[PDB]
């Protein structure tokens, strides 16, 4: 029973980063070689594990988080980073155990006139904790005047659209990102390599 990685990486549609998707992966054999032999990824790095050893390891829980961000924001999907993605949308732990995988999706996620379906959070009263998700749409109080859900001066709707356009430079183009987290919790293993 092979793990449903084709579902995660080859899905027609990806989530916005503020509403990033989580898929639990369990009770299956994980052929990471379909990934670590492929040459389609612009980013493929792991923390606490080596990419060539994943086929020899067993884990209690495996989660696949996926979303779309700009190419020049992929750097923020790393331990210790700051910026609107790391602070307000998707936060990796400082001691992250897992892998970060990304690839250019300009051919799929850009549109003439701009694809406005992909959103990110621009304002928040505090930084996200690791693996936290915030899907609220409350008006952000940037000044001394309470907003009371009314959008206006100093009172901002907290989400903004990327507006991906196909003629953008590579840094401004959309990138699809999958974060694999490998969890050990003193229980039997559910996900193992093809051994």
């Amino acid at each position, epitope marked *: 029973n092979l793990c449903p990685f084709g579902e995660v990486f080859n899905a027609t549609r990806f989530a916005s980063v503020y509403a990033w998707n989580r898929k639990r992966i369990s009770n299956c054999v994980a052929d990471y070689s379909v990934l670590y032999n492929s040459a389609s*990824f612009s980013t*493929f*790095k792991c*923390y606490g594990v080596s990419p060539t050893k994943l086929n020899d390891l067993c884990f209690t829980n495996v989660y696949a988080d996926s979303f779309v961000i700009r190419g020049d924001e992929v750097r923020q999907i*790393a331990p210790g*980073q700051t910026g609107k993605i790391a602070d307000y949308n998707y936060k990796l732990p*400082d001691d992250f155990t897992g892998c970060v995988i990304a690839w250019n999706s300009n051919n799929l996620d850009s549109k003439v006139g701009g694809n406005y379906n992909y959103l990110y959070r621009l304002f928040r009263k505090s930084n996200l904790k690791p693996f936290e998700r915030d899907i609220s749409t409350e008006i952000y109080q940037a000044g001394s005047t309470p907003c009371n859900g009314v959008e206006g001066f100093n009172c901002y709707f907290p989400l903004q659209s990327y507006g991906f356009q196909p003629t953008n430079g590579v840094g401004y183009q959309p990138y699809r990102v999958v974060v694999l987290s490998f969890e050990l919790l003193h229980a039997p293993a559910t996900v193992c390599g093809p051994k």
Partner: nanobody
Amino acid sequence: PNSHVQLVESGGGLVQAGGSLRLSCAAPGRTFSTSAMGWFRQAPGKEREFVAAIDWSNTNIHYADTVKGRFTISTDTAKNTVYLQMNNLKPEDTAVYYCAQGGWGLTQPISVDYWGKGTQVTVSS
């Protein structure tokens, strides 16, 4: 220069060929204990090249072929410092040596997240 993660190298200097020298890199290993630590070097007119890599558990050690049997990478137990012990130094080892923190890459040993400032090593014949 403004990131929370900062890496500071020290120990560079002038050494005679055949001598030894140990570089140090202060690093936030207690906090970022799962990241890969590595050393790079860049000589004048050449591209930066990989030298060595290690995790904070003193395992998963990688070496470039040019330094195998001469260089040794290691960490301290409190996860505060990475080291590059250099033995039987040659003139070709002259370069600015950089410390780096990142993740274990698929196409290369380390996909770097953070860079140090570098320390100058000069080997004279």
